């Protein structure tokens, strides 16, 4: 389903995903990709660069294509991504970790 999007990398490892979004250092703050979960099959992960460090956010994709991130529900993964391009990801560390999604790592 998600294989038509350039930011979807399928079953890449957590370590590989982290290195992909960290490659350009803190200048790539907000750069992201989406992958299959490596430790919980059937689930997905948004991996993104935060101040040069990789962070990983679990996503649930329903059979209808809708996307849940913890308490937040979106009609699609694309809608979730656009939401976090416009509004900061509400992480626990608050303003010291402000991040909006920016670019993405293109799948090979």
């Amino acid at each position: 389903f998600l294989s038509c999007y350039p930011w979807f990398h399928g079953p890449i490892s957590r370590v590989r995903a982290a290195q992909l979004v960290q490659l350009q250092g803190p200048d790539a703050h907000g750069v992201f990709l989406v992958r299959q979960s490596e430790s919980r099959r059937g689930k997905y992960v948004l991996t993104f660069n935060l101040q040069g460090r990789a962070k990983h956010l679990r996503l649930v994709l329903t059979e209808r294509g809708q996307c849940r991130v913890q308490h937040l529900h979106f009609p699609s993964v694309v809608d979730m991504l656009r939401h976090f391009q416009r509004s900061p990801i509400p992480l626990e560390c608050g303003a010291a970790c402000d991040v909006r999604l920016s670019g993405y790592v293109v799948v090979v």
């Binding site: 992960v45 990983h56 956010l57 913890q70 990801i89 509400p90 992480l91």
Partner: peptide
Amino acid sequence: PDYELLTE
């Protein structure tokens, strides 16, 4: 491993 938690 570890995954991020959001403020709720």
